[PDB]
Amino acid sequence: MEYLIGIQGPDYVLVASDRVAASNIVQMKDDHDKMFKMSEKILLLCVGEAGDTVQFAEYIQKNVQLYKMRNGYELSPTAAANFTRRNLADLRSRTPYHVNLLLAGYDEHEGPALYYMDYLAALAKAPFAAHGYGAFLTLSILDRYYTPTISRERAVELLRKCLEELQKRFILNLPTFSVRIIDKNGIHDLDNISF
Amino acid sequence: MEYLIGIQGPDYVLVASDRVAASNIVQMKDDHDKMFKMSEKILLLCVGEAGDTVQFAEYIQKNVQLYKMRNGYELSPTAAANFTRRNLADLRSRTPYHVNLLLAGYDEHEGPALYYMDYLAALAKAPFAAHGYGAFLTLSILDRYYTPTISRERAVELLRKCLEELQKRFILNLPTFSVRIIDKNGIHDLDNISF
Amino acid sequence: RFSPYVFNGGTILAIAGEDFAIVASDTRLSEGFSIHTRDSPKCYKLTDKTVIGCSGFHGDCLTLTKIIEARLKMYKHSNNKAMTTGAIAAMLSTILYSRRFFPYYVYNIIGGLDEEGKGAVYSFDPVGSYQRDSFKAGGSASAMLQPLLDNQVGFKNMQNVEHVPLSLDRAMRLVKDVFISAAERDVYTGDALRICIVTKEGIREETVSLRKD
Amino acid sequence: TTTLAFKFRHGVIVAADSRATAGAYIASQTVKKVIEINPYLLGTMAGGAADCSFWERLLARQCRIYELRNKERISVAAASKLLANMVYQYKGMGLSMGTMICGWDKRGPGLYYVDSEGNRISGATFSVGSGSVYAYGVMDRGYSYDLEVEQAYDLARRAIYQATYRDAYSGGAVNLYHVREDGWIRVSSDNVADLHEKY
Amino acid sequence: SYDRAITVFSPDGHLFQVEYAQEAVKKGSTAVGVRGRDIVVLGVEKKSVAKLQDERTVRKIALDDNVCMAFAGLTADARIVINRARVECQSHRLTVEDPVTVEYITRYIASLKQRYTQ
Amino acid sequence: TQNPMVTGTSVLGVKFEGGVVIAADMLGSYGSLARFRNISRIMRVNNSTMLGASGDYADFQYLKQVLGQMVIDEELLGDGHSYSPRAIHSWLTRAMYSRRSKMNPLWNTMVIGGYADGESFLGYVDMLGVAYEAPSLATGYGAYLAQPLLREVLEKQPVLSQTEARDLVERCMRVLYYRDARSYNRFQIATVTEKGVEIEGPLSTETNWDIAHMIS
Amino acid sequence: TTIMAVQFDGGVVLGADSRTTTGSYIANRVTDKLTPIHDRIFCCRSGSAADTQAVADAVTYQLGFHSIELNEPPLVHTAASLFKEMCYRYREDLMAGIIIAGWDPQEGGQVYSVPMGGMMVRQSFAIGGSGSSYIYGYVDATYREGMTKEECLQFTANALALAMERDGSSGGVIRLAAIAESGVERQVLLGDQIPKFAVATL
Amino acid sequence: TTIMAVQFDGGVVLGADSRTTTGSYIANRVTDKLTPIHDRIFCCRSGSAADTQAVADAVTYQLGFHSIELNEPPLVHTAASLFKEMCYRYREDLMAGIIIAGWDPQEGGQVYSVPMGGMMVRQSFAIGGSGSSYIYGYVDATYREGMTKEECLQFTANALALAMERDGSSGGVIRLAAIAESGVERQVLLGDQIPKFAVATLP
Amino acid sequence: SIMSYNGGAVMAMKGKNCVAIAADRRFGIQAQMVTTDFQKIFPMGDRLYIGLAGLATDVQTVAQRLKFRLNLYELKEGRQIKPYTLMSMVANLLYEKRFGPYYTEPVIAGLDPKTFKPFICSLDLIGCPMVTDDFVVSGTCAEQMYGMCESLWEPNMDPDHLFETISQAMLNAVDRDAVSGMGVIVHIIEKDKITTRTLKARMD
Amino acid sequence: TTIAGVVYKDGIVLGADTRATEGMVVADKNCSKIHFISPNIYCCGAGTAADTDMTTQLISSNLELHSLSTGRLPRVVTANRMLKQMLFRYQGYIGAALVLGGVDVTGPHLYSIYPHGSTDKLPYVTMGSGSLAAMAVFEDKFRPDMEEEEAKNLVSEAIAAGIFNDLGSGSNIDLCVISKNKLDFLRPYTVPNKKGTRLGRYRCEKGTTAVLTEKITPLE
């Protein structure tokens, strides 16, 4: 099962994702990128049932690019998250997309925005969120230490404590972790955290 | 899923086991000993369904110790392995024991002996053996490098290659590994191999 | 193969006071969509200091009490005294557990006095776990009585309230009001209300009607 | 339902909540989820309540028989193994149990996990229950062998607090016991809603 | 099966078969054990030495790793009692995860000798 | 028994001033077939207890055998005791529940009526052991079709004369014949009073089909 | 549920019970089970209660409009073929065994059994419903070729009364109908007018 | 499978078909379905083929030894109660509806229907088997209080021939038996001797 | 159950010239709490709110299609919607998925914009309108809420005591429900103002 | 759910309960089960409440078409045909079992419509869970050509027996009188069940419940 985590700060969002792609007893990819760039100020994190993830994420991604082509400006993360929610909810048809999502975005009127979404397309905005069975192990530490005014290096430390809990207690081999931060200057890639 | 591995050499047997006890998403013990001392020259490695393992292993263990009390000498590993096979086989009863077993023993007259056994109690003597889903990933390396005249340093080197294959490719978090070796001087504990 | 339980409804209610215990029950007996009888009390006097409440499957409710009165008279023979309330509870926990793998589908609530003259309510599961409470609702309509008693007895979610002890005259009106609230909204509870008050003088009864529909 | 216990330098700290549920309906908020075995041993409640309570009461009877006959108290390794041999026979008939045996024997501290699945393991830290996964994260980030006593109280109450905060099925009252060499003593009994004001 | 009473009371308080069982004690080999403070040393007598004997099988002296014992009287009864005590000791090792104390198996053998007097 | 095959439908009963009257048809159905048309489903147990049973009929004959041999073995002693109907009702509760506990029920739903010490007894036992008393009882579809008439009359007037209770029973049996598919117009009435148990039957109900001319 | 039609010289005699049960509770005890598809053509409804009323409206529509266009009284075989097509076309969603009886000037009195399947077969007498199994042996033994109208009305009343006695899912009143050139003569047998057979007493 | 017994003054008349099918293939077309339990007591076998012989051997065993002890020809009600007890005791593993008919000097001709269940009921006539549903209505209409022997034999042959005509699981020859004080007279109706009912042909 | 996968519980209660509507704030996945500020009560007018409990994704689906239809209504007509018309619109919208039903049981509480008569109602999950004069509740702890509101409701209350009884009803009801709670918002709809309050609640 | 109807000398008398239950809990206390369809046709709806709600909206709407189109008051058999065609077209998946009662130019009629589309014409009907208890009273006491007050007391007594002897019904009796010369919708007719008086008072004063946030939004 795949792991997601995102932390929304005062003027930033920190997201992280596991870098493993597995098959039934073995992992086939140890540099797996689950972070799909939607535009200059929004990332879409995509885990779940295989096939539905990359198809759904790229089908959203070409419409997010297409709105910029038609209009000359970007979708707000509220509008893009509601658009993604509408396409995922439009479920009671034949076609299931059993995807678990996080959308992180920075708006140039509202600041940092982080959106949680399950496979029902229940959209819930949260100060921090996490997917996978590792969420059951790490959201409690997030409730332990998170304050609304965490500065970004303390957020890297709080992320590192959660990743060390993945190493210590969680039974799946999750050794390498990619991390990005979205700001007013766009998307920033950080160094891979490894164990 | 729990892991076992054993290598039978010219005058020694080298066995190793994972040191993890898990509970459905989390591990609950990281110093778990799956090696139970039967007597001075015999170990039984025990994995499988929880509860069946320890009850079956201790029930065999007190009968081996009881034979030593009644007679003043030890069971041969052939006799104790057939005894364990008979007790596991008596399967179709109201008390099935879903246990997976390796037995390593040294005899004065026959030398080192290693026995493979599944939950059917099919008894097969082998130069090397392994259980778990991790066996599927390392019996190939054991087929690659094992010769019948491997000395024990090449045995710990090949075991280190096998556990590094567990670290690189196998999806369950198996970080720490206990190893023991049996020869004519009794049982010897070796240093834990960690990652 | 013989679906061996039928939920025969009913709610029981017990409140442990400072020096009393009140036990109440409906008397309507049901089976799905039918009313069997309108006078079938669920409060069974065990000894002079303990009355028991029954809810659940009615056949086990009869069988279990025919066991308990026999065990009480065996105790009164072999030990030359009546049982205490805690002794009855500890006995009935073993009796309910000894039918582990075919349980008595009975929710037992033992009310009465201990040896120190205080109220004790012992509310059980079908498989024999037990605990002492100050008040307890059981049976069918428990979810309509138990939050209101959580409001009025434990005084939760109230600010600026004096936690007065449990007087009799307010507790009796509480029992009548919660059963009117249960009879207005639950189909299974109604047709009477039988109230047993255990005090040091003895056990008395009061009967109030409920909704007939 | 969330229970945890951990060994450290000055003994065993045992903490438990008090919520028992019936589906979505909450039946009680005052469940004593640490069962008092004897003046030196504690058992714990997870999964089935009566399944825990009967076998631990009968184990208390068993160890009192052993105290009368062998003229000495019981070790943890013997008593938890007798609990395992009681619950091993009835695998597959529908039993549900999660327990920790906590006492003080000649090996020092004692903390063994026994369940109705048959598992019997040692360990320095444990947590059992439905919201136990949230308790592990808060517990292990502060855990070490060199914990001070009151800081261990704070860590236990904080881990049960966050476990009750995330789990819908866990709640009630945070009960805290401390087994030392001379016996077990009650520390505190605290509502969750008061600790939300404190934290 | 066979269920007569063999050991019955005599006219003055003397289970005849218990007196005769102690007679069967009285003609066996004499045995001693002496306790030092860090050793216990056992000494048993030989019967009918017979220099053709293979000495290995006529030893009269391990119930566990820690406990041995001496006897006197009918030898097959002694070997029976030792084979009862050894299986009880290993069942004790099964249930308590500790080796036996000497009092537990001595009380067990002391009750085993009485249960067959009644 | 897992399969009832030969079954009997509703049995009524109502207390009156001085005794108990119960009634039952004389049909043994086999699925939908009216296979047996002249069977009696009412047992006279002794001079002060009568018994009528719905449901599976073979189990009713087993209870006739056992409960007849009980009262014969009581009367062999000749000490002057007779089973009060409360004793027979408690015995049937224990026998039906003990058969239930073996996962092997007696597929019946029985009504015990009697009159002892001047007091009328009317008691219900089903195949689970749910047992109670009532001023009026009705098993099967009588519990929905004939029970409301009995309780509607009993609310206005809790004390019934003998002929009033007999006509109330006949007027409920007319309702069951109009509205139960497994009933039959050939029924018995058993009445226990101070003088003992009588059984009157076979009787018949007289129909009114004037609504058949009320189609158009 | 017991319906019966008997062909005689000059017309047909129909018969039906009047008990409609849901489970073992009588939902209607004066049910009219003879539906006029045209003036002198009746269909009988056994099986699913919805389908035999739902198809019959379509067949009544088609047969009435067909009779208006062709300027004739419609045939009974036409009314049977309009059921044989339609009850076959929807046969997996219908549970309908229809007994069509009637009269036409061209071929006389006619009884068509359309069993569950959407076929068609003319018979000298047809019995249907759940109760017909109990009166197969009566009508194989009693039927004589060429009975009069009164003989046939007594034969239909006796054969229905036997099935109403034995089958628990049948009962009520006997509704007869005698369809001929002079018209349709309906009658209801209630209470004592139903032919009585004494129980095998002693 | 169609068996039938009819009580008359002085004895009973039994009848049975002779077709035993497994699926829709006739396994035996001359099956004898009347089993003598004693001299003048016959039981009839409809339902499970094993049980109605295996219980009947035990009842014959008990009833002969009982008759030897009592020095009396055994009753028909005794032979019915030995089935009512035993088929009830194993009713979950038996599928057995028996029609016991016979004669005794004490109460005359007797027909006991023991339906699948282990009860017991005396009737004036009893029909059983798979085919009896098609001839309930005939025998409710034809039976008269007090038929003679030959009228009963013609009534049993007609009622069996109707069920053999309509039911596909019945056919063959009609084996009759008339049990009375004088003894048992058996006869077989084959081919033309079976009473014939012309088909309802079109005119 | 599919209704109880997210939990949730909303009630309404009628007062003298005012209505009160309160919804829980827990957004749940069967055992795991995710957030504690989930919005279920949406404005559909000046003095008219709609509350939707049940499956939290169907709350947002039904509420977005409802706002889509209602904005077209109020632009095409030139008036605010009367609450009975909103009840018929939501029952129509749910019944259009009769055999594909949304898992939400909406409650509606508001004031008539001209007469200012109090109105409350609820629905089932498929569109049966239930207009009551005392209270309507909806969600996984329905028995707790009927138990509190049957005893605490009294007719003709001022907005202060209506706030007091709906607050005590919510807080005592949700503390016996595992999968609901975690905070509660209370909306008091008056003729001249709207009062929006959140309460001290158990967070376990 | 207990509804009933009779055909008396001048028309139709319909009755109902008011208790509507969801699960095994009373949800509504004063639910109206006698639907308006036409000025002369009323349609009691039993079973699935939402399905019979939208059905007695839609057929009411189609009769509002048809009565205006022809300019005459509609017949019973028109609503009968529309109901049986729609309920057969959905094969009973609409869980509404109806009582369609009305008075048209050919006198009164009473139809009972089962959800699959089978129709019966009856002199008296009962539907719902308490249908058997009121059917007992009708089999006991119905006569053809009854007067108005005898029919009103008969339906009210039958609804009363179905209220007292069923769990699934209760708390009011609604009636309806339909005739050629009058329409009398008596809601309610008799209230056999009454809430008991609350003995204690639990009125919480201001400040009893703690408040965390508060926002006052003024309006015009």
Curated annotation (Swiss-Prot), chains A, B:
Induction: Up-regulated in ovarian cancer cell lines. Its main location: cytoplasm. It comes from the Eukaryota. InterPro entries: Ntn_hydrolases_N, Proteasome_beta2, Proteasome_bsu_CS, Proteasome_sua/b, Proteasome_suB-type. GO terms for cellular component: cytoplasm; cytosol; extracellular exosome; membrane; nucleoplasm; nucleus; proteasome complex; proteasome core complex. Keywords: Acetylation, Cytoplasm, Host-virus interaction, Nucleus, Proteasome. GO terms for biological process: proteasome-mediated ubiquitin-dependent protein catabolic process. The modification N-acetylmethionine is found at M1. Pfam families: Proteasome. It is found in: Cytoplasm; Nucleus. Non-catalytic component of the 20S core proteasome complex involved in the proteolytic degradation of most intracellular proteins. This complex plays numerous essential roles within the cell by associating with different regulatory particles. Associated with two 19S regulatory particles, forms the 26S proteasome and thus participates in the ATP-dependent degradation of ubiquitinated proteins. Belongs to the peptidase T1B family. This is Proteasome subunit beta type-2. It comes from Homo sapiens. The gene is PSMB2.
Curated annotation (Swiss-Prot), chain C:
One of its GO terms (biological process) is proteolysis involved in protein catabolic process. The keyword Glycoprotein applies. It is linked to Neurodevelopmental disorder with microcephaly, hypotonia, and absent language: An autosomal recessive disorder characterized by microcephaly, intellectual disability with absent speech, severe developmental delay, short stature, and hypotonia. Affected individuals also manifest aggressive behavior and have hearing loss. It is found in: Cytoplasm; Nucleus. SUPFAM superfamilies: N-terminal nucleophile aminohydrolases (Ntn hydrolases). This is Proteasome subunit beta type-1. Its main location: cytoplasm. Belongs to the peptidase T1B family. The modification Phosphotyrosine is found at Y122.
Curated annotation (Swiss-Prot), chain D:
It is found in: Cytoplasm; Nucleus. The chain holds residues 60 to 258 of 263 of the full protein. The 26S proteasome consists of a 20S proteasome core and two 19S regulatory subunits. The 20S proteasome core is a barrel-shaped complex made of 28 subunits that are arranged in four stacked rings. The two outer rings are each formed by seven alpha subunits, and the two inner rings are formed by seven beta subunits. The proteolytic activity is exerted by three beta-subunits PSMB5, PSMB6 and PSMB7. Directly interacts with POMP. Interacts with ABCB1 and TAP1. (Microbial infection) Interacts with HIV-1 TAT protein. Its main location: cytoplasm. GO terms for cellular component: centrosome; cytoplasm; cytosol; extracellular exosome; nucleoplasm; nucleus; proteasome complex; proteasome core complex. This is Proteasome subunit beta type-5. Component of the 20S core proteasome complex involved in the proteolytic degradation of most intracellular proteins. This complex plays numerous essential roles within the cell by associating with different regulatory particles. Associated with two 19S regulatory particles, forms the 26S proteasome and thus participates in the ATP-dependent degradation of ubiquitinated proteins. It catalyses: Cleavage of peptide bonds with very broad specificity. Its EC number is 3.4.25.1. The keyword Hydrolase applies. Bortezomib binds at A49. Belongs to the peptidase T1B family. The active site is at T1 (nucleophile).
UniProtKB/Swiss-Prot annotation, chain I:
GO terms for biological process: proteasome-mediated ubiquitin-dependent protein catabolic process. Induction: Up-regulated in asthenozoospermic sperm. The modification N6-acetyllysine is found at K76. CDD domains: proteasome_beta_type_3. The modification N-acetylserine is found at S1. It is found in: Cytoplasm; Nucleus. Keywords: Acetylation, Cytoplasm, Host-virus interaction, Nucleus, Proteasome. GO terms for cellular component: cytoplasm; cytosol; extracellular exosome; nucleoplasm; nucleus; proteasome complex; proteasome core complex; proteasome core complex, beta-subunit complex. Its main location: cytoplasm. Gene3D superfamilies: Glutamine Phosphoribosylpyrophosphate, subunit 1, domain 1. The keyword Transport does not apply. Pfam families: Proteasome. InterPro entries: Ntn_hydrolases_N, Proteasome_beta_3, Proteasome_bsu_CS, Proteasome_sua/b, Proteasome_suB-type. Non-catalytic component of the 20S core proteasome complex involved in the proteolytic degradation of most intracellular proteins. This complex plays numerous essential roles within the cell by associating with different regulatory particles. Associated with two 19S regulatory particles, forms the 26S proteasome and thus participates in the ATP-dependent degradation of ubiquitinated proteins. Belongs to the peptidase T1B family. This is Proteasome subunit beta type-3. The gene is PSMB3.
